[PDB]
Design a protein around this ligand. Sequence first.
Ligand SMILES: [Mg+2]
Ligand SMILES: [Mg+2]
Ligand SMILES: [Mg+2]
Ligand SMILES: [Mg+2]
Ligand SMILES: [Mg+2]
Ligand SMILES: [Mg+2]
Ligand SMILES: [Mg+2]
Ligand SMILES: [Mg+2]
Ligand SMILES: [Mg+2]
Ligand SMILES: [Mg+2]
Ligand SMILES: [Mg+2]
Ligand SMILES: [Mg+2]
Ligand SMILES: [Mg+2]
Ligand SMILES: [Mg+2]
Ligand SMILES: [Mg+2]
Ligand SMILES: [Mg+2]
Ligand SMILES: [Mg+2]
Ligand SMILES: [Mg+2]
Ligand SMILES: [Mg+2]
Ligand SMILES: [Mg+2]
Ligand SMILES: [Mg+2]
Ligand SMILES: [Mg+2]
Ligand SMILES: [Mg+2]
Ligand SMILES: [Mg+2]
Ligand SMILES: [Mg+2]
Ligand SMILES: [Mg+2]
Ligand SMILES: [Mg+2]
Ligand SMILES: [Mg+2]
Ligand SMILES: [Mg+2]
Ligand SMILES: [Mg+2]
Ligand SMILES: [Mg+2]
Ligand SMILES: [Mg+2]
Ligand SMILES: [Mg+2]
Ligand SMILES: [Mg+2]
Ligand SMILES: [Mg+2]
Ligand SMILES: [Mg+2]
Ligand SMILES: [Mg+2]
Ligand SMILES: [Mg+2]
Ligand SMILES: [Mg+2]
Ligand SMILES: [Mg+2]
Ligand SMILES: [Mg+2]
Ligand SMILES: [Mg+2]
Ligand SMILES: [Mg+2]
Ligand SMILES: [Mg+2]
Ligand SMILES: [Mg+2]
Lengths: 129, 185, 175
Amino acid sequence: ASLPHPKIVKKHTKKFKRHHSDRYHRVAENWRKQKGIDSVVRRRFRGNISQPKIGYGSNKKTKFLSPSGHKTFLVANVKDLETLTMHTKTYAAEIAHNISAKNRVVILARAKALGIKVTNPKGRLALEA
Amino acid sequence: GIDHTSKQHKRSGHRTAPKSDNVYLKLLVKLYTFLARRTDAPFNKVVLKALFLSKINRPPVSVSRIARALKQEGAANKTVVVVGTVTDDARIFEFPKTTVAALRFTAGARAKIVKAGGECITLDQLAVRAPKGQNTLILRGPRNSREAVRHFGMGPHKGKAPRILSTGRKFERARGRRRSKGFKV
Amino acid sequence: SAQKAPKWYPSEDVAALKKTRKAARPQKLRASLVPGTVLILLAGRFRGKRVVYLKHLEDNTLLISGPFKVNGVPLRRVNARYVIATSTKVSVEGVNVEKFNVEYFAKEXXXXXXXXXXXXXXXXXXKEIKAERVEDQKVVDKALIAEIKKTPLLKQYLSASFSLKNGDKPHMLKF
RNA sequence: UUGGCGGAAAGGCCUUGGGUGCUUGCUGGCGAAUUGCAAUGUCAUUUUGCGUGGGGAUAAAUCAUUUGUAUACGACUUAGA
RNA sequence: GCCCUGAAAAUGGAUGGCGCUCAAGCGUGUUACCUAUACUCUACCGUCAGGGUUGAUAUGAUGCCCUGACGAGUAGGCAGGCGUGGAGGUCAGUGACGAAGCCUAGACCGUAAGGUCGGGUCGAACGGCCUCUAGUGCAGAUCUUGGUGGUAGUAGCAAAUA
RNA sequence: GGAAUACUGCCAGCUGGGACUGAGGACUGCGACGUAAGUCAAGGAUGCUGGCAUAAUGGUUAUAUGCCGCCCGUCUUGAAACACGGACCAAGGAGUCUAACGUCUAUGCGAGUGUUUGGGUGUAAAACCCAUACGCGUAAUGAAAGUGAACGUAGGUUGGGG
RNA sequence: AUAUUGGCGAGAGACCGAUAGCGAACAAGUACAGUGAUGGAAAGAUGAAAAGAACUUUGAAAAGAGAGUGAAAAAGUACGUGAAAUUGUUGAAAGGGAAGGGCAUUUGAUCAGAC
Ligand SMILES: [Mg+2]
Ligand SMILES: [Mg+2]
Ligand SMILES: [Mg+2]
Ligand SMILES: [Mg+2]
Ligand SMILES: [Mg+2]
Ligand SMILES: [Mg+2]
Ligand SMILES: [Mg+2]
Ligand SMILES: [Mg+2]
Ligand SMILES: [Mg+2]
Ligand SMILES: [Mg+2]
Ligand SMILES: [Mg+2]
Ligand SMILES: [Mg+2]
Ligand SMILES: [Mg+2]
Ligand SMILES: [Mg+2]
Ligand SMILES: [Mg+2]
Ligand SMILES: [Mg+2]
Ligand SMILES: [Mg+2]
Ligand SMILES: [Mg+2]
Ligand SMILES: [Mg+2]
Ligand SMILES: [Mg+2]
Ligand SMILES: [Mg+2]
Ligand SMILES: [Mg+2]
Ligand SMILES: [Mg+2]
Ligand SMILES: [Mg+2]
Ligand SMILES: [Mg+2]
Ligand SMILES: [Mg+2]
Ligand SMILES: [Mg+2]
Ligand SMILES: [Mg+2]
Ligand SMILES: [Mg+2]
Ligand SMILES: [Mg+2]
Ligand SMILES: [Mg+2]
Ligand SMILES: [Mg+2]
Ligand SMILES: [Mg+2]
Ligand SMILES: [Mg+2]
Ligand SMILES: [Mg+2]
Ligand SMILES: [Mg+2]
Ligand SMILES: [Mg+2]
Ligand SMILES: [Mg+2]
Ligand SMILES: [Mg+2]
Ligand SMILES: [Mg+2]
Ligand SMILES: [Mg+2]
Ligand SMILES: [Mg+2]
Ligand SMILES: [Mg+2]
Ligand SMILES: [Mg+2]
Ligand SMILES: [Mg+2]
């Protein structure tokens, strides 16, 4: 349903949790660079956790691409959906989390007419089911 | 690894584009940057570097400093380009005719040059007449005359000017400025 | 807008590929293989059986008989690398072989609606054979079999399957 | 099935005698395909639950009660149809 | 030269251990072999440098494209970014057909700051973008206030006769 | 007297096996083989064929196994320390505002410049308009009384972009 | 014409939004402590409306179970939403002197893309 594109290699798939985020509960899982002077993470000792850094950068050809080979462009309503009409082999409409069950059947039904990939096709609309 | 014989990734000291957001200014660049490419004309390169400068390095060029340069032998009919502002001077009297293309003219300065039967041109009307920059005299203002630099390299026996708020005889005229009190500088 | 509409979008035109320089040359077989040589099938259904090498097909495969009336292996295709060639030999001279090409061995076209419907529902749906193949199997064999009765023990040999015993170190054994 | 031998952890090793299947020692007649050009292309041995059919046997322990050769408490040691 | 005597320290004990005696010891020599984030080659990320191109000819000129080199880092400097309370503008933006909040070893995007969808709960308001403004981001301060554990069904509940 | 072989070196000599990679995306170039049209291993992978389409590959997650991995913050030449703080969790929590100034950048005007003390007006703390002053600048130098910047095309010499 | 953190009366705000903002959004200079001078808190939110659970049954009774009100009782005067520590039950997993992490795969669980 997309342009051909090179094969996508993520090149690092672990999530980079913060050091000690597991041990203490007060320490959240979002990444943070250890700034400490003694730190064994900051100093990169063998067998400690990886740090994020620009070398893990993703290929510019495939960046922001979903597995389907699409970019996902967030869509709040029917008149938004119609900005994508040309790029239908490129961008794939996502429907904004807060849209009502009633307006979604109208988005979906109108995006079927345009041949646009919808990435969350079963919303509250299968919740009518 | 390598032995580096010089600092790595070190970016050239030079302004690659005007730090101003003036739309019209960036247009001018768009013009000359294209000329610097597609003609040889060392002149155009000079102008492009000129557009980029900070205001401190585009000091005003007087009208009288233009008059002076037109009196250089064989220069009469050359058109004088100033990237920066041209300003008025009340001190000269009899002013030549010619043409002056600049970034900016103050009102008096413009009235001075047109009343002499001359002409005031912008940088682009300058490129239409002289794409190569044929027969043109580039001028620069006296950028070391700027006040601030009286203070530079301040130090003993340097003959430079102390940074100071207010001047009278009670301010830094006493000990170390004359041999009667201590030493002299 | 849920999300601000982007300033570019790329062009959906899919570019053609560059003119590639690769020519398909004739495949060159290793020295050991010559028509009439006896082969040892190293995998597949008939893996382990010893068989007789007839022709070299266009698709780089090997035409094979074995022949069927002996060890029960039919005419067939075999990939050249899945074989061990022995040093022993039979004359393939009096054998036709000029008929069989890649098209001859073409599988019947499989339908995506029928191979789901007839395979899942009927697991007792039974195989059959084209009357042709079974006759052109005969022809090959009557020339081959007549040749296999020349040398002593050969007939027993082909029927008997091959395998490695203890102490057998394949980097040694000559075949 | 007849006997023997094996206590080092013997749980196996020989032997008599008949019954029964195979026998490529040799000579034959049939069958094999399509698993489509390879995909381990599954065969082994461990427990445990139910199921059919037969042989087999038909108890204890703890608490509670109780002794004091015992005992912080459990534990130990006794007695009770 | 090797080996032995010379040669004695406190918990049990250290060629790292096991153990090795034409060695698995010492001296020497010859090859084969194992292995680093080093070197070579290729891919991708970023930075810097040098360079090409809107000439009429759709959607970024701070853009697209080409070639090369490089990449450790505390104190520290600069740059591009993500996040929060409010403000001007704008999507005639989202919303009782469920807004925000919380929950989720369910999914996707980003090197990451974080962003996005799905499900459950819930019941009234809230977001994207261009800009403005700050009482704007927490793991620590014997930090401050509130809440709750382990300790632990433990220490204990034994003066004054019953 | 006549050769051979080893050793060291060269071949723009010939051939078999093996593993990893397949970036790029019309054509432009350098070549090669050719009598010729053309073909090619010559500025980066294509051709043939099979199974499955369905939890199979891949993702996440729990776990096992090999190998590695001391507890964070901090002062310190040196911290896993038998140095200090830290039981646990939530909310709060620390380079701010102002007067005067320096360098730099941006914008306005430019020998001038600054409306907003005050006056006028107003859709009313906004916005719009303005007189005279005053500040800083256009002249220095002396403790001061005091004097006050063209012999020359505002000079000569050496470089110096254009 | 100038002053004005007091008193009375009005009008506002790029201010705070219940650990903030005055100490005090509530019976706050209250309760409470101290001989005294003084010191000085915590504490807002059921629902549109109490419609605040008649009646049956079990228990000595609080209550429980039904019943009913209500859009909702996953709003029951312990009351909007209801996080975390911490805790109970069920489920899944592992466990020879800690647990936790990194690299890689097996086993189990689980899930997107697919067209
Ligand atoms: Mg990721
Ligand atoms: Mg250190
Ligand atoms: Mg390097
Ligand atoms: Mg000794
Ligand atoms: Mg030892
Ligand atoms: Mg020793
Ligand atoms: Mg050693
Ligand atoms: Mg050793
Ligand atoms: Mg040695
Ligand atoms: Mg560049
Ligand atoms: Mg660095
Ligand atoms: Mg946001
Ligand atoms: Mg605020
Ligand atoms: Mg919601
Ligand atoms: Mg959780
Ligand atoms: Mg703060
Ligand atoms: Mg906080
Ligand atoms: Mg905290
Ligand atoms: Mg810290
Ligand atoms: Mg504390
Ligand atoms: Mg306690
Ligand atoms: Mg007790
Ligand atoms: Mg008591
Ligand atoms: Mg006591
Ligand atoms: Mg007593
Ligand atoms: Mg040699
Ligand atoms: Mg490719
Ligand atoms: Mg030719
Ligand atoms: Mg797998
Ligand atoms: Mg270790
Ligand atoms: Mg010290
Ligand atoms: Mg430390
Ligand atoms: Mg110590
Ligand atoms: Mg200290
Ligand atoms: Mg402590
Ligand atoms: Mg006042
Ligand atoms: Mg308060
Ligand atoms: Mg007192
Ligand atoms: Mg409440
Ligand atoms: Mg109410
Ligand atoms: Mg509700
Ligand atoms: Mg409660
Ligand atoms: Mg209450
Ligand atoms: Mg509640
Ligand atoms: Mg919890």
